Design a protein around this ligand. Structure first.
Ligand SMILES: [Ca+2]
Ligand SMILES: [Ca+2]
Ligand SMILES: [Ca+2]
Ligand SMILES: [Ca+2]
Ligand SMILES: [Cl-]
Length: 136
């Protein structure tokens, strides 16, 4: 499962996301418990612009291991990219509960409120992002 996964990663790092999918699928046939392989499969679909597929595989990775602030953040991103701002907010909140110093999660939470026309809330979360990254 290791070589298949790293073979997938070598294609991923080049922007060859569909080749990466084939090899991540092979890694997961051998080790269906690999949160890493699920997560990176979801990343490959995200990069392919298939947010519904990314969400299914991120959900599976988060089922096996609900600890990465990064994984909740990327689940929020996938929902954001398909216009599901309620769900994006839910998952960005979960990300921030695990990593309050994520300027990225505060910023995207701002953006989700901005997209809903909630500019008062957007401004609150952009200000939090700027406390952590004042060079944003
Ligand atoms: Ca083996
Ligand atoms: Ca290349
Ligand atoms: Ca080459
Ligand atoms: Ca390709
Ligand atoms: Cl990783």
């Amino acid at each position: 499962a290791e070589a298949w996964y790293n073979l997938g990663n070598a294609y991923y790092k080049q922007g060859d996301y569909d080749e990466a999918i084939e090899y991540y699928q092979k890694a997961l046939e051998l080790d269906p418990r690999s949160a890493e392989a699920w997560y990176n499969l979801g990343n490959a679909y995200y990069k392919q612009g298939d947010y519904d597929e990314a969400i299914e595989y991120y959900q599976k990775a988060l089922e096996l291991d609900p600890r990465s602030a990064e994984a909740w953040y990327n689940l929020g991103n996938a929902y954001y990219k398909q216009g599901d701002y309620d769900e994006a907010i839910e998952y960005y909140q979960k990300a921030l509960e695990l990593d309050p110093r994520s300027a990225e999660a505060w910023y995207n939470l701002g953006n989700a409120y901005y997209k809903q026309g909630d500019y008062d809330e957007a401004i609150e979360y952009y200000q939090k992002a700027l406390e952590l990254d004042p060079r944003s």
